[PDB]
Amino acid sequence: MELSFGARAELPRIHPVASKLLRLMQKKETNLCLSADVSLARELLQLADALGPSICMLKTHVDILNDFTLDVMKELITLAKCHEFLIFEDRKFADIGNTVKKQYEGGIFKIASWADLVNAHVVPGSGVVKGLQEVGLPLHRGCLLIAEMSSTGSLATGDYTRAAVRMAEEHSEFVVGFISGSRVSMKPEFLHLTPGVQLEAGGDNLGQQYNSPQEVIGKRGSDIIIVGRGIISAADRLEAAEMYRKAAWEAYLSRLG
Amino acid sequence: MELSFGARAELPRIHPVASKLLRLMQKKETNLCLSADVSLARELLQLADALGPSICMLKTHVDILNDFTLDVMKELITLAKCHEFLIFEDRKFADIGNTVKKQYEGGIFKIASWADLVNAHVVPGSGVVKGLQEVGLPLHRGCLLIAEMSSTGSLATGDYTRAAVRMAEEHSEFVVGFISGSRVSMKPEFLHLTPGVQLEAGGDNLGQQYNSPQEVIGKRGSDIIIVGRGIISAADRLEAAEMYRKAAWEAYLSRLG
Ligand SMILES: O=c1ccn([C@@H]2O[C@H](COP(=O)(O)O)[C@@H](O)[C@H]2S)c(=O)[nH]1
Ligand SMILES: O=c1ccn([C@@H]2O[C@H](COP(=O)(O)O)[C@@H](O)[C@H]2S)c(=O)[nH]1
């Protein structure tokens, strides 16, 4: 009784951004999000173009790009359109509502102008969502709430995770899903994206902990895997991206029946 | 048995950044931090120069500055040195450790190059501190941990606040204090900075809640008030800044004895 991505795209209460994402996931047979954690625009754009066909989403940290310009994001949008993926700026908004409005819309980055999706921490209360929504809703954008984290010592557990789910439910015109390690909402309209994913077990020296695609998608019920170093540090990023795509997509299919 | 700012500056376990801050607070008789939430470099630099003598710290959001350049931060450093205040970039780092390293050091903003202090959320676990420390410690910088928030619905309460205090204790070579609404640590080496401060009662429409200087400093035991709109929206920002300085400084003095 679990709906395919394609069916989820047609759900009555689905956000237009999620519906576009779910349709291209189904069409392209990819539930992989590339975490393009690179410091040079040329590498960001070469990864986006080569791996574009293999991904449903490209997750950015534009505040690490040494040569950021708006023209770089224009070229990135051209590739997102060509290859059909969404752009997700992983900014983790977590300030008071009044402040996040200007961070999302303005400054040098003008995130709301090119980011299909942003994410936000729920620790400040619902004002963080309300502030972002004042910019994002008129621009037809979506937001993800951070309901759990993959890093050691995370405090996003128990009642904190529950607060994030309730917050999402109550703001469904803008909040389209979660960053979590597992399915945290029983409503199929919400997307679940899981970072801290690698084919092999382990972590890093700065608190990151990894789980496999089959575990996160197949057993823990998430929709999309967010993968950075497992792809970016490989020699052949395209075959690495294809390996992760096949793992996550088959895990999804075997969960469907 | 409460030590003056001047004495706290000499405590054996005090961080060099906190000691410099505590000395200038004492010398200038100001425990006021100006939240310079403006979008134009000219207004940021005109506020820093005119209110510099009245402040112990200028808190920035460089990601809302429409015309940010590194030369703007050079001119801001010239004013911080001239007038003797610290610069605090209110970035609220809250990502995995590996990611925050590059956000703090690199990108367009090169925050670590000009920010005496940054702050960080504790929700990801201690990896956020460890990541920032790898850049900040070699540069002799300090970090503040967000132990409580002033916004409605905040989840930074109870065991979350306690986790932030423990995290600070265990990283005292880099963590110099807290963003909180009250004294949360009994160790005088740590600084307590409190936002959500205005002379009059009220809030905003996006979740902000205000308390007075006398309440935050005098009754709740914080060290420094962080004030934005109560100064920036006033016609005469200098007299507004002087009003807040006198409130916070007298409240401190009456707490001493
Ligand atoms: O809870 C989270 C939330 C976000 N991320 C992001 O996902 C990417 C993973 O990068 P990787 O380890 O190289 O695969 C990084 O950009 C970080 S901030 C997490 O990791 N955990
Ligand atoms: O828990 C917090 C942490 C930080 N701040 C920041 O302090 C400033 C207050 O701005 P004001 O309302 O205009 O005085 C803003 O930049 C916000 S992000 C809080 O408010 N609460």
Numbering used by the authors:
A (entry chain A), B (entry chain A): 223 to 479
Lines from the paper:
The ligand 2′-SH UMP binds in the active site in a defined manner, and its 2′-thiol group is well resolved due to the strong electron density. Thus, the interaction of the 2′-SH group with Asp317′ is lost, and a new hydrogen bond between Lys314 and 2′-SH is formed with an interatomic distance of ∼3.2 Å. Based on the crystal structure, we speculate that, although sulfur is a better nucleophile, its size prevents proper binding because it displaces Asp317′ from the active site. This finding further supports our previous observations that substrate binding in OMPDC involves not only direct interactions between the ligand and protein residues in the active site but also an extended hydrogen bond network between the two monomers, which is sensitive even to minor changes.
Orotidine 5′-monophosphate decarboxylase (OMPDC) converts orotidine 5′-monophosphate (OMP) into uridine 5′-monophosphate (UMP) and CO2 during the final step of de novo pyrimidine synthesis, which is essential for producing DNA and RNA nucleotides. Recognized as one of the most efficient enzymes, OMPDC accelerates the decarboxylation rate by a factor of 1017, and exhibits a net transition-state stabilization (ΔG #) of 31 kcal/mol. Its unique ability lies in achieving this substantial enhancement without the aid of bioorganic cofactors or metal ions, relying solely on interactions between the substrate OMP and residues at the active site. However, the key catalytic amino acids at the active site are highly conserved, including two lysines (K281, K314) and two aspartic acids (D312, D317), which form the so-called catalytic tetrad in the sequence Asp317-Lys314-Asp312-Lys281 (numbering from the human enzyme).
